[PDB]
Amino acid sequence: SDIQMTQSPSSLSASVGDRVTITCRASQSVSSAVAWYQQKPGKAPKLLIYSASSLYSGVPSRFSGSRSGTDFTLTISSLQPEDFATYYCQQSYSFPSTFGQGTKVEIKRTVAAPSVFIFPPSDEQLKSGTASVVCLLNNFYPREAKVQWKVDNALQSGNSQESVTEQDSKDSTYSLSSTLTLSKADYEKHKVYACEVTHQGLSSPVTKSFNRGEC
Amino acid sequence: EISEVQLVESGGGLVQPGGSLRLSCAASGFYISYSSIHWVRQAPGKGLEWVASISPYSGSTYYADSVKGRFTISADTSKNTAYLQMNSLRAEDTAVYYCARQGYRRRSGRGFDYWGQGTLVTVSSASTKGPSVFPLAPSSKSTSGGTAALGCLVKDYFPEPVTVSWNSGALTSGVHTFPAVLQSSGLYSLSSVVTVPSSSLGTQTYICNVNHKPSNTKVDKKVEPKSC
RNA sequence: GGUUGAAACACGACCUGAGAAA
DSSP states (O other), X not given: OOOOEEEEOSEEEEETTOOEEEEEEESSOOTTOEEEEEEOTTSOOEEEEETXXXXXXXXXXXXXXXXXXXXXXXEESSOOGGGOEEEEEEEOSSSSOEEOOOEEEEEEOOOBOOEEEEEOOOHHHHTTTEEEEEXXXXXXXXXXXXXXXXXXXXXXXXXXXXXXXXXXXXXXXXXXXXXXXEEXXXXXXXXXXXXXXEOTTOSSOEEEEEETTOO | OOOOOEEEEEOOEEEOTTOOEEEEEEEESSOGGGSOEEEEEEOTTOOEEEEEEEOTTTOOEEEOTTTTTTEEEEEEGGGTEEEEEEOSOOGGGOEEEEEEEEOOHHHXXXXXEXXXXXXXXXXXXXXXXXXXXXXXXXXXTOOBTTBEEEEEEEEEEBSSOOXXXXXXXXXXXXXXXXXXXXXXXXXXXXXXXXXXXXXXBTTBOEEEEEEEGGGTEEEEEEEOOOOO
Protein backbone atom coordinates (compact mmCIF):
# COMPACT_ATOMS: atom_id res chain seq x y z
CA SER A 1 0.00 0.00 0.00
CA ASP A 2 2.04 2.93 -1.29
CA ILE A 3 1.45 6.42 0.08
CA GLN A 4 -0.89 8.38 -2.19
CA MET A 5 -0.71 12.15 -2.75
CA THR A 6 -4.09 13.70 -3.70
CA GLN A 7 -3.82 17.16 -5.32
CA SER A 8 -6.57 19.77 -5.69
CA PRO A 9 -7.82 21.59 -7.72
CA SER A 10 -7.26 19.74 -10.99
CA SER A 11 -6.73 23.09 -12.71
CA LEU A 12 -7.17 26.75 -11.98
CA SER A 13 -7.25 30.00 -13.92
CA ALA A 14 -6.20 33.20 -12.14
CA SER A 15 -5.15 36.71 -13.19
CA VAL A 16 -1.78 38.35 -12.73
CA GLY A 17 -1.49 39.64 -9.17
CA ASP A 18 -3.92 37.06 -7.79
CA ARG A 19 -3.22 34.90 -4.77
CA VAL A 20 -3.43 31.23 -5.74
CA THR A 21 -3.31 28.14 -3.53
CA ILE A 22 -2.87 24.47 -4.42
CA THR A 23 -3.27 21.60 -1.94
CA CYS A 24 -2.01 18.04 -1.65
CA ARG A 25 -3.15 15.48 0.93
CA ALA A 26 -1.05 12.47 1.89
CA SER A 27 -2.93 9.23 2.52
CA GLN A 28 -0.87 8.64 5.68
CA SER A 29 1.82 10.53 7.56
CA VAL A 30 4.77 11.69 5.46
CA SER A 31 6.09 13.89 8.31
CA SER A 32 7.30 17.09 6.56
CA ALA A 33 9.08 15.28 3.70
CA VAL A 34 7.13 17.04 0.92
CA ALA A 35 8.52 18.96 -2.05
CA TRP A 36 6.74 21.12 -4.62
CA TYR A 37 7.78 21.49 -8.26
CA GLN A 38 6.84 23.64 -11.23
CA GLN A 39 6.88 21.92 -14.66
CA LYS A 40 6.49 23.43 -18.11
CA PRO A 41 5.28 20.86 -20.67
CA GLY A 42 8.10 18.65 -21.91
CA LYS A 43 10.70 20.32 -19.66
CA ALA A 44 12.33 19.31 -16.41
CA PRO A 45 10.44 20.14 -13.24
CA LYS A 46 11.93 22.95 -11.08
CA LEU A 47 12.18 22.70 -7.26
CA LEU A 48 10.16 25.38 -5.43
CA ILE A 49 9.64 24.18 -1.83
CA TYR A 50 11.31 21.46 0.23
CA SER A 51 10.53 19.93 3.63
CA ALA A 52 6.93 21.23 3.28
CA SER A 53 7.62 24.90 4.05
CA SER A 54 11.21 25.85 3.07
CA LEU A 55 11.91 28.00 0.02
CA TYR A 56 14.67 26.57 -2.17
CA SER A 57 17.53 29.03 -2.71
CA GLY A 58 16.91 31.36 -5.64
CA VAL A 59 13.18 30.67 -6.04
CA PRO A 60 11.06 33.86 -6.09
CA SER A 61 9.62 34.86 -2.74
CA ARG A 62 6.02 34.81 -4.02
CA PHE A 63 6.16 31.02 -3.57
CA SER A 64 5.65 29.49 -0.13
CA GLY A 65 4.51 26.22 1.40
CA SER A 66 2.82 25.06 4.57
CA ARG A 67 1.75 21.89 6.35
CA SER A 68 -1.23 21.01 8.52
CA GLY A 69 -1.12 17.34 9.45
CA THR A 70 -1.26 15.40 6.17
CA ASP A 71 -2.48 18.43 4.15
CA PHE A 72 0.17 20.44 2.28
CA THR A 73 -0.43 23.80 0.64
CA LEU A 74 1.55 25.67 -2.00
CA THR A 75 0.76 29.41 -2.16
CA ILE A 76 1.67 31.89 -4.91
CA SER A 77 1.09 35.26 -3.23
CA SER A 78 0.97 37.39 -6.43
CA LEU A 79 0.75 35.40 -9.68
CA GLN A 80 3.12 36.34 -12.54
CA PRO A 81 2.48 35.68 -16.27
CA GLU A 82 5.29 33.11 -16.58
CA ASP A 83 3.80 31.04 -13.71
CA PHE A 84 1.59 28.95 -16.01
CA ALA A 85 2.68 25.33 -15.58
CA THR A 86 1.65 22.06 -13.99
CA TYR A 87 2.59 22.04 -10.29
CA TYR A 88 3.37 18.74 -8.53
CA CYS A 89 3.76 17.74 -4.91
CA GLN A 90 6.07 14.87 -3.99
CA GLN A 91 6.55 12.84 -0.82
CA SER A 92 9.94 11.36 -0.02
CA TYR A 93 9.11 10.15 3.49
CA SER A 94 9.67 6.54 2.41
CA PHE A 95 10.55 4.60 -0.71
CA PRO A 96 8.95 4.46 -3.22
CA SER A 97 8.60 8.19 -3.71
CA THR A 98 5.19 9.28 -4.96
CA PHE A 99 3.90 12.38 -6.73
CA GLY A 100 0.54 14.09 -6.81
CA GLN A 101 -1.33 14.07 -10.10
CA GLY A 102 -0.52 17.74 -10.83
CA THR A 103 -2.50 20.99 -10.85
CA LYS A 104 -2.57 22.90 -14.13
CA VAL A 105 -2.30 26.68 -13.65
CA GLU A 106 -3.47 28.97 -16.46
CA ILE A 107 -3.16 32.77 -16.55
CA LYS A 108 -6.57 34.39 -16.84
CA ARG A 109 -6.81 37.59 -18.86
CA THR A 110 -9.20 39.63 -20.99
CA VAL A 111 -10.87 38.25 -24.09
CA ALA A 112 -8.83 38.53 -27.32
CA ALA A 113 -10.34 37.73 -30.72
CA PRO A 114 -8.29 35.49 -33.06
CA SER A 115 -6.82 36.56 -36.37
CA VAL A 116 -7.69 33.89 -38.95
CA PHE A 117 -5.69 32.69 -41.97
CA ILE A 118 -6.34 29.86 -44.44
CA PHE A 119 -3.63 28.07 -46.44
CA PRO A 120 -4.26 25.87 -49.50
CA PRO A 121 -2.12 22.77 -50.03
CA SER A 122 1.10 23.27 -51.95
CA ASP A 123 1.51 21.97 -55.48
CA GLU A 124 4.50 20.00 -54.18
CA GLN A 125 2.37 18.08 -51.69
CA LEU A 126 -0.40 17.27 -54.18
CA LYS A 127 2.11 15.35 -56.33
CA SER A 128 2.27 12.70 -53.57
CA GLY A 129 -1.50 12.09 -53.46
CA THR A 130 -2.64 13.91 -50.31
CA ALA A 131 -3.83 17.46 -49.67
CA SER A 132 -3.53 19.32 -46.35
CA VAL A 133 -5.54 22.51 -45.83
CA VAL A 134 -4.50 24.60 -42.83
CA CYS A 135 -6.48 27.13 -40.80
CA LEU A 136 -4.60 29.30 -38.30
CA LEU A 137 -6.21 31.13 -35.38
CA ASN A 138 -3.64 33.53 -33.97
CA ASN A 139 -3.15 35.13 -30.54
CA PHE A 140 -6.53 34.66 -28.87
CA TYR A 141 -7.98 34.21 -25.40
CA PRO A 142 -9.65 32.21 -23.88
CA ARG A 143 -8.48 28.87 -25.28
CA GLU A 144 -11.96 27.69 -26.26
CA ALA A 145 -12.80 28.07 -29.94
CA LYS A 146 -14.72 26.23 -32.65
CA VAL A 147 -13.30 25.65 -36.13
CA GLN A 148 -15.67 24.42 -38.84
CA TRP A 149 -14.43 23.32 -42.27
CA LYS A 150 -16.71 23.73 -45.29
CA VAL A 151 -15.96 22.33 -48.74
CA ASP A 152 -18.30 23.66 -51.45
CA ASN A 153 -20.52 24.83 -48.55
CA ALA A 154 -20.70 21.26 -47.15
CA LEU A 155 -19.77 20.87 -43.48
CA GLN A 156 -16.83 18.51 -42.97
CA SER A 157 -16.62 15.80 -40.31
CA GLY A 158 -13.98 13.41 -39.03
CA ASN A 159 -11.15 14.58 -41.32
CA SER A 160 -9.42 17.35 -39.33
CA GLN A 161 -7.11 17.67 -36.33
CA GLU A 162 -6.30 20.62 -34.06
CA SER A 163 -3.18 21.56 -32.10
CA VAL A 164 -2.75 24.50 -29.69
CA THR A 165 0.30 26.35 -28.41
CA GLU A 166 0.94 26.95 -24.75
CA GLN A 167 0.22 30.42 -23.38
CA ASP A 168 2.42 33.33 -24.46
CA SER A 169 4.82 34.17 -21.64
CA LYS A 170 4.20 37.92 -22.10
CA ASP A 171 0.52 38.47 -22.92
CA SER A 172 -1.02 35.03 -22.11
CA THR A 173 -2.64 34.31 -25.51
CA TYR A 174 -2.98 31.04 -27.45
CA SER A 175 -2.74 30.12 -31.10
CA LEU A 176 -4.43 27.17 -32.78
CA SER A 177 -4.05 25.26 -36.04
CA SER A 178 -6.70 23.10 -37.69
CA THR A 179 -5.52 20.82 -40.49
CA LEU A 180 -8.01 19.29 -42.95
CA THR A 181 -6.64 16.23 -44.78
CA LEU A 182 -8.14 15.12 -48.11
CA SER A 183 -7.06 12.82 -50.89
CA LYS A 184 -5.80 14.63 -53.97
CA ALA A 185 -8.76 13.26 -55.95
CA ASP A 186 -11.24 14.61 -53.40
CA TYR A 187 -9.43 17.96 -53.27
CA GLU A 188 -9.53 18.36 -57.06
CA LYS A 189 -13.28 17.55 -57.13
CA HIS A 190 -14.27 20.72 -55.22
CA LYS A 191 -13.73 24.46 -55.61
CA VAL A 192 -14.41 26.52 -52.46
CA TYR A 193 -12.58 25.73 -49.21
CA ALA A 194 -13.56 27.63 -46.09
CA CYS A 195 -12.62 27.79 -42.40
CA GLU A 196 -15.31 29.20 -40.09
CA VAL A 197 -14.24 30.40 -36.64
CA THR A 198 -16.44 31.14 -33.63
CA HIS A 199 -14.87 32.66 -30.52
CA GLN A 200 -16.14 34.99 -27.85
CA GLY A 201 -13.84 37.77 -29.09
CA LEU A 202 -15.81 37.93 -32.37
CA SER A 203 -19.24 39.52 -32.63
CA SER A 204 -20.00 37.33 -35.65
CA PRO A 205 -18.19 34.20 -36.89
CA VAL A 206 -15.26 34.83 -39.24
CA THR A 207 -14.90 32.77 -42.43
CA LYS A 208 -11.74 32.63 -44.53
CA SER A 209 -11.95 30.98 -47.93
CA PHE A 210 -10.10 30.32 -51.15
CA ASN A 211 -10.97 28.92 -54.56
CA ARG A 212 -8.79 25.98 -55.60
CA GLY A 213 -6.42 27.03 -58.38
CA GLU A 214 -7.68 30.63 -58.33
CA CYS A 215 -4.50 32.29 -57.07
CA GLU B 1 35.17 30.12 -14.77
CA ILE B 2 31.96 29.69 -12.81
CA SER B 3 31.22 26.02 -12.09
CA GLU B 4 27.56 25.26 -12.85
CA VAL B 5 25.69 22.18 -11.68
CA GLN B 6 24.56 20.29 -14.79
CA LEU B 7 23.10 16.87 -15.59
CA VAL B 8 23.42 15.88 -19.25
CA GLU B 9 21.42 12.86 -20.38
CA SER B 10 21.99 10.59 -23.36
CA GLY B 11 21.09 7.17 -24.68
CA GLY B 12 17.37 7.53 -25.31
CA GLY B 13 15.61 6.86 -28.56
CA LEU B 14 13.60 4.25 -30.42
CA VAL B 15 13.73 0.63 -29.21
CA GLN B 16 11.79 -2.49 -30.15
CA PRO B 17 9.50 -4.10 -27.55
CA GLY B 18 11.41 -6.63 -25.49
CA GLY B 19 14.65 -4.76 -26.22
CA SER B 20 17.15 -3.01 -23.97
CA LEU B 21 18.55 0.49 -23.58
CA ARG B 22 21.00 2.21 -21.26
CA LEU B 23 20.48 5.84 -20.31
CA SER B 24 23.38 7.97 -19.11
CA CYS B 25 23.36 10.99 -16.81
CA ALA B 26 26.71 12.79 -16.94
CA ALA B 27 27.15 15.26 -14.09
CA SER B 28 29.25 18.40 -13.83
CA GLY B 29 29.68 20.99 -11.08
CA PHE B 30 29.47 18.45 -8.24
CA TYR B 31 30.84 15.03 -7.36
CA ILE B 32 28.09 12.42 -7.76
CA SER B 33 29.60 10.27 -4.97
CA TYR B 34 28.10 12.56 -2.32
CA SER B 35 24.51 12.83 -3.65
CA SER B 36 21.55 10.55 -4.10
CA ILE B 37 20.68 10.31 -7.80
CA HIS B 38 17.15 9.51 -9.00
CA TRP B 39 15.41 8.58 -12.23
CA VAL B 40 11.89 9.97 -12.83
CA ARG B 41 9.84 9.40 -15.96
CA GLN B 42 6.79 11.01 -17.57
CA ALA B 43 4.67 9.06 -20.03
CA PRO B 44 2.78 10.97 -22.75
CA GLY B 45 -0.10 12.84 -21.14
CA LYS B 46 0.66 11.49 -17.65
CA GLY B 47 2.33 12.83 -14.52
CA LEU B 48 5.71 12.23 -12.95
CA GLU B 49 6.54 8.67 -11.86
CA TRP B 50 9.55 7.94 -9.67
CA VAL B 51 11.57 5.01 -11.09
CA ALA B 52 14.79 4.33 -9.14
CA SER B 53 17.50 5.84 -6.93
CA ILE B 54 21.06 5.21 -5.71
CA SER B 55 22.43 6.41 -2.33
CA PRO B 56 25.77 8.04 -1.49
CA TYR B 57 28.51 6.24 0.50
CA SER B 58 26.67 2.88 0.38
CA GLY B 59 25.56 2.64 -3.23
CA SER B 60 22.26 1.20 -2.00
CA THR B 61 19.62 1.09 -4.73
CA TYR B 62 15.84 1.40 -4.74
CA TYR B 63 13.18 0.73 -7.39
CA ALA B 64 9.53 1.29 -8.15
CA ASP B 65 7.49 -1.92 -8.36
CA SER B 66 6.71 -1.08 -12.01
CA VAL B 67 10.39 -1.56 -13.00
CA LYS B 68 11.79 -3.88 -10.32
CA GLY B 69 13.72 -6.79 -11.80
CA ARG B 70 13.96 -5.18 -15.26
CA PHE B 71 15.78 -1.89 -14.62
CA THR B 72 19.13 -1.34 -12.90
CA ILE B 73 20.45 1.97 -11.59
CA SER B 74 24.19 2.44 -11.08
CA ALA B 75 26.89 5.09 -10.79
CA ASP B 76 30.47 5.20 -12.08
CA THR B 77 32.10 7.78 -9.84
CA SER B 78 35.30 7.66 -11.96
CA LYS B 79 33.23 9.13 -14.83
CA ASN B 80 30.88 11.17 -12.59
CA THR B 81 28.03 9.45 -14.43
CA ALA B 82 24.86 7.62 -13.38
CA TYR B 83 23.07 5.04 -15.51
CA LEU B 84 19.65 3.44 -15.93
CA GLN B 85 19.94 0.07 -17.68
CA MET B 86 16.53 -0.96 -19.00
CA ASN B 87 15.72 -4.54 -20.05
CA SER B 88 12.55 -6.22 -21.36
CA LEU B 89 11.06 -2.92 -22.45
CA ARG B 90 7.31 -2.61 -22.96
CA ALA B 91 5.19 0.02 -24.68
CA GLU B 92 4.15 1.18 -21.21
CA ASP B 93 7.78 2.24 -20.66
CA THR B 94 7.59 4.89 -23.41
CA ALA B 95 8.31 8.20 -21.68
CA VAL B 96 10.67 11.09 -21.18
CA TYR B 97 13.19 9.92 -18.60
CA TYR B 98 14.87 12.42 -16.31
CA CYS B 99 17.77 12.04 -13.95
CA ALA B 100 17.68 14.28 -10.88
CA ARG B 101 20.02 15.18 -8.04
CA GLN B 102 18.62 14.98 -4.55
CA GLY B 103 20.03 18.10 -2.92
CA TYR B 104 22.16 18.41 0.19
CA ARG B 105 20.16 17.61 3.31
CA ARG B 106 20.78 20.82 5.26
CA ARG B 107 20.05 23.07 2.22
CA SER B 108 17.26 21.22 0.40
CA GLY B 109 16.03 18.32 2.58
CA ARG B 110 15.08 15.52 0.19
CA GLY B 111 14.01 17.81 -2.64
CA PHE B 112 15.42 17.17 -6.11
CA ASP B 113 17.23 20.44 -6.82
CA TYR B 114 18.81 19.80 -10.26
CA TRP B 115 17.46 17.78 -13.19
CA GLY B 116 18.69 16.54 -16.53
CA GLN B 117 17.13 17.82 -19.71
CA GLY B 118 15.14 14.62 -20.32
CA THR B 119 15.61 11.93 -22.94
CA LEU B 120 12.77 10.36 -24.89
CA VAL B 121 12.49 6.57 -24.96
CA THR B 122 10.02 5.25 -27.56
CA VAL B 123 9.19 1.54 -27.34
CA SER B 124 7.78 0.65 -30.78
CA SER B 125 8.39 -1.69 -33.74
CA ALA B 126 7.75 1.17 -36.21
CA SER B 127 10.59 2.43 -38.42
CA THR B 128 12.29 5.81 -38.33
CA LYS B 129 11.00 8.11 -41.07
CA GLY B 130 12.14 11.63 -41.94
CA PRO B 131 9.58 14.34 -42.64
CA SER B 132 8.45 16.11 -45.77
CA VAL B 133 8.26 19.90 -45.49
CA PHE B 134 5.71 21.96 -47.42
CA PRO B 135 5.17 25.74 -47.58
CA LEU B 136 2.20 27.52 -46.05
CA ALA B 137 2.23 30.45 -48.47
CA PRO B 138 1.31 34.06 -47.49
CA SER B 139 -0.47 36.84 -49.46
CA SER B 140 -0.84 40.65 -49.38
CA LYS B 141 -4.52 39.87 -50.17
CA SER B 142 -4.76 37.64 -47.03
CA THR B 143 -4.43 39.97 -44.00
CA SER B 144 -5.95 39.58 -40.53
CA GLY B 145 -5.31 41.55 -37.36
CA GLY B 146 -2.97 43.82 -39.33
CA THR B 147 -0.48 41.16 -40.49
CA ALA B 148 0.09 38.46 -43.07
CA ALA B 149 0.93 34.89 -42.05
CA LEU B 150 3.08 32.14 -43.53
CA GLY B 151 4.52 28.87 -42.34
CA CYS B 152 5.82 25.37 -42.91
CA LEU B 153 3.93 22.09 -42.67
CA VAL B 154 6.17 19.21 -41.39
CA LYS B 155 4.52 15.83 -42.19
CA ASP B 156 4.65 11.90 -41.90
CA TYR B 157 7.73 11.67 -39.49
CA PHE B 158 8.66 9.16 -36.72
CA PRO B 159 9.61 9.11 -33.89
CA GLU B 160 9.39 12.52 -32.22
CA PRO B 161 10.90 15.11 -32.04
CA VAL B 162 11.30 17.72 -34.75
CA THR B 163 12.42 21.29 -34.21
CA VAL B 164 11.75 24.31 -36.43
CA SER B 165 13.49 27.69 -36.64
CA TRP B 166 13.08 30.61 -39.02
CA ASN B 167 15.87 32.41 -40.91
CA SER B 168 18.45 30.35 -38.98
CA GLY B 169 17.05 31.68 -35.71
CA ALA B 170 17.15 35.37 -36.62
CA LEU B 171 13.32 35.47 -36.83
CA THR B 172 11.60 34.67 -33.54
CA SER B 173 8.96 37.38 -33.09
CA GLY B 174 5.51 36.10 -34.00
CA VAL B 175 6.65 32.49 -34.47
CA HIS B 176 4.32 29.72 -33.27
CA THR B 177 5.44 26.10 -33.59
CA PHE B 178 2.56 23.82 -32.72
CA PRO B 179 2.79 20.55 -30.78
CA ALA B 180 3.04 17.45 -32.92
CA VAL B 181 -0.13 15.52 -33.73
CA LEU B 182 -0.23 11.77 -34.31
CA GLN B 183 -2.01 10.90 -37.56
CA SER B 184 -3.99 7.73 -38.22
CA SER B 185 -1.01 6.45 -40.24
CA GLY B 186 1.07 6.36 -37.04
CA LEU B 187 3.27 9.24 -38.25
CA TYR B 188 3.49 12.72 -36.75
CA SER B 189 2.84 16.12 -38.29
CA LEU B 190 3.12 19.68 -37.07
CA SER B 191 3.08 23.19 -38.44
CA SER B 192 5.17 26.23 -37.65
CA VAL B 193 3.79 29.65 -38.55
CA VAL B 194 4.79 33.30 -38.24
CA THR B 195 2.92 36.57 -38.69
CA VAL B 196 4.76 39.25 -40.67
CA PRO B 197 4.07 42.69 -42.13
CA SER B 198 2.21 42.37 -45.43
CA SER B 199 4.50 45.09 -46.88
CA SER B 200 7.50 42.79 -46.30
CA LEU B 201 6.37 39.94 -48.58
CA GLY B 202 8.61 40.36 -51.64
CA THR B 203 11.05 42.58 -49.77
CA GLN B 204 11.99 39.94 -47.17
CA THR B 205 12.97 36.25 -47.33
CA TYR B 206 11.47 33.64 -45.02
CA ILE B 207 13.15 30.24 -44.67
CA CYS B 208 12.01 27.54 -42.26
CA ASN B 209 14.81 25.31 -40.92
CA VAL B 210 13.51 21.84 -40.01
CA ASN B 211 15.54 19.38 -37.91
CA HIS B 212 14.68 15.68 -37.37
CA LYS B 213 17.70 14.15 -35.65
CA PRO B 214 16.43 10.50 -35.55
CA SER B 215 16.61 10.46 -39.37
CA ASN B 216 19.48 12.99 -39.71
CA THR B 217 17.09 15.18 -41.70
CA LYS B 218 18.01 18.87 -42.00
CA VAL B 219 15.76 20.71 -44.47
CA ASP B 220 15.50 24.40 -45.33
CA LYS B 221 12.36 25.53 -47.15
CA LYS B 222 11.88 28.98 -48.63
CA VAL B 223 8.33 30.27 -48.18
CA GLU B 224 7.22 32.91 -50.69
CA PRO B 225 3.94 34.21 -52.12
CA LYS B 226 2.83 32.27 -55.18
CA SER B 227 3.05 34.04 -58.55
CA CYS B 228 -0.69 34.57 -58.91
C1' G C 1 10.06 14.06 15.84
C1' G C 2 14.32 17.45 15.31
C1' U C 3 19.79 18.95 14.50
C1' U C 4 24.20 17.22 12.04
C1' G C 5 28.57 14.27 9.49
C1' A C 6 28.32 16.00 1.22
C1' A C 7 24.97 10.77 4.72
C1' A C 8 16.64 8.33 4.24
C1' C C 9 19.98 2.30 4.16
C1' A C 10 25.02 0.95 5.64
C1' C C 11 29.12 3.73 8.38
C1' G C 12 28.98 8.14 12.66
C1' A C 13 27.83 12.37 16.46
C1' C C 14 23.67 14.57 18.96
C1' C C 15 18.66 16.99 21.00
C1' U C 16 13.59 16.49 22.92
C1' G C 17 11.29 12.48 25.52
C1' A C 18 9.14 7.06 29.36
C1' G C 19 10.21 5.58 24.43
C1' A C 20 12.04 8.42 18.04
C1' A C 21 8.97 2.26 14.86
C1' A C 22 6.62 7.76 18.85
